Amino acid sequence: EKTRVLVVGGTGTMGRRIVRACLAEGHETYVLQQPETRVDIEKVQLLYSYKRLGARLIEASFSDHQSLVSAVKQVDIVVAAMSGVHFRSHSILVQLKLVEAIKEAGNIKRFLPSEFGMDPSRMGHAETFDQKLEVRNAIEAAGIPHTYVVGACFAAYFAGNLSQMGTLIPPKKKVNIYGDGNVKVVYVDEDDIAEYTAKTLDDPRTINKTVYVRPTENVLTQMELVQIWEKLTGKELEKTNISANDFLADIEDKLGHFYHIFYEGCLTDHEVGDDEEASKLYPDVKYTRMDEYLKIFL
Amino acid sequence: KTRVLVVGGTGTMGRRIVRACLAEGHETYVLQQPETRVDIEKVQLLYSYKRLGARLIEASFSDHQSLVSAVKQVDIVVAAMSGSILVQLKLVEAIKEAGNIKRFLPSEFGMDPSRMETFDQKLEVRNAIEAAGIPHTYVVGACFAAYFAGNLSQMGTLIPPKKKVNIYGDGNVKVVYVDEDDIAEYTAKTLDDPRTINKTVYVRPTENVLTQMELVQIWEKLTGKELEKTNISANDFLALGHFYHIFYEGCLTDHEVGDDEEASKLYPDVKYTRMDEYLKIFL
């Protein structure tokens, strides 16, 4: 009656939260560990800390198809979390090795690919979305049941820096505001994305569906967010409004993923049913409001 | 209540010291240099310290006055380098200029550079420390278990061998194997202990003075399997560097230490991790 979950990418920013959420939810949790992590002091100490909490380590490589199928047949569900900072420009596409291994094994009840972000296929008029769309097309062709978890703006990347580029912590005097800071955004603590992911991966209501992560009180414009900050610090920030016009679309150096969120409005340009939204399907997840999220920075 | 500034608090050894200081009750400070603000792993780490009670001090190593400013906020400075050992000299000159530091522990937790390229560097740092007048403690004398024990002292890996193990020599050369968290804990009990001021403290928990063969058979008792041993002579050992002094010349226990200078006897309430227990997580 307990679900066996394999987390692929268990040592990344988002991967490690999913490993810990799956353990906190009672899942028998398996963590893919590649051959090349036996020389990496922080990856070994990280992987073996999951073991202390009950996880299991299964070694396999992505280049080695039999070790991948040998790996996914020890589990019921596969979650991939393969984007950001310990990954590469194309390691989303490496999930096609996983889909081809999952189909050969036949036992997989669900596959949750690396999707935690803007819903691609809402992005036909803008590549990250093409790699994620190609991984979905392979999932669906192979007949693997899926959940896509989408719709979130990572708080460590857009909230803790007041949506400032160039930094991950609040600025001391200035803040650039995009447009009129009037575009609604969905700032979410990545731990909440991970907890929602671990509650949904075996919920029968979400099989072969998309699950939007939009906890209501954290739907917030950028100026509403920096006003949660200004209030906490008691200090009003100097605000340069940046117009849609001012367009780095040319050969300086970076994204313009920012333009999709803070100008297009594309995280909140589509109402969500309460049968498609994570805060509503899992109301027991006391998600982190952004006034509490930011307090750690004062 | 001692205040402690931990320089290098995001390294593998620094981060254990920050947590050991906070656990002992010290008022622990960690530097956050300006290069940190784009690095997500350092940022998660640093603010995970704030959540446990530590305070961050913004400063940079190329701006002398913020280091001076940073060491004035605190009584004791512990450096732990893993990120370059000679940047402790800039630290030494700021600690001179601020004059308020009761004690400096420089980055030294490996093997003692008086037996003794990183030791010309550790000794240059010591001579700056003692030229400058700064009361000091040198915590030395240990093989970190994550580099020499979990792998049963195999090179190229950090997890134990499946079926073949290499034995250096007869494997009857005594080595000292210490969990790095006990190095951090000892480092936290010692930084303000009146007896270790201007002394050198040896981390040599007696039950973890082991030959490589004795360690390989702590593993053989846990698993109940015998590994295939290939004995590798001194001369066959050819391309650390450091493996040859530790395992063929026995550098870690040429000198027998007194109970006045050794952490497990100065602090016997520290129930250090034995290798029969450190290795359990790998089965």
Residue numbers in the entry:
A (entry chain A): 8 to 133, 139 to 266, 274 to 317
B (entry chain C): 9 to 91, 98 to 130, 139 to 261, 274 to 317
Structure paper excerpt:
Intriguingly, the β4 loop is well defined in the AtPrR1_NAP structure but disordered in the AtPrR1/2_apo structures. These structural differences suggest that the loops are somewhat flexible, and act as a switch to control the binding of NADPH and release of NADP+.
Here, we present crystal structures of IiPLR1 from Isatis indigotica and pinoresinol reductases (PrRs) AtPrR1 and AtPrR2 from Arabidopsis thaliana, in the apo, substrate-bound and product-bound states. β4 loop covers the top of the pocket, and residue 98 from the loop governs catalytic specificity.
